[PDB]
A and B are shown apart, each in its own frame.
Chain A
Amino acid sequence: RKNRRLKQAKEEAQAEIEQYRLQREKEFKAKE
């Protein structure tokens, strides 16, 4: 399950990163 895990966790972390990026960049607008 080498390849399965590696290039499924790649897009897994894609989703995770976009998730946290938006959840960090919204309260920015709130206090702004």
Chain B
Amino acid sequence: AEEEFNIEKGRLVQTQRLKIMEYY
């Protein structure tokens, strides 16, 4: 329950922060 959304946030946050950083 907790771990699921935990690593969910982790994965998506990382894989989108990388993209926005590269773009900007």
Other-chain contact of B24, A8, A13, A28 (Cβ < 8 Å): A28
Task: Assign chain B's interface to a size class.
Answer: 10 to 19
Q: Is the interface of B mostly helix, strand, loop or mixed?
A: helix
Q: In the complex, what residues of A have CB within 8 A of residue B16's CB?
A: 13, 17, 20
Are A10 and B24 neighbours in the complex by a CB distance under 8 Å?
no
Residue numbers of B with Cβ under 8 A of A are 1-2, 4-5, 8-9, 12-13, 16-17, 20-21, 24
A20 to B22, CA, bound (A): 13
Q: Is the interface of A mostly helix, strand, loop or mixed?
A: helix
Closest 8 CB pairs of A and B: A9-B5, A5-B5, A1-B1, A13-B12, A17-B16, A9-B8, A24-B24, A21-B20
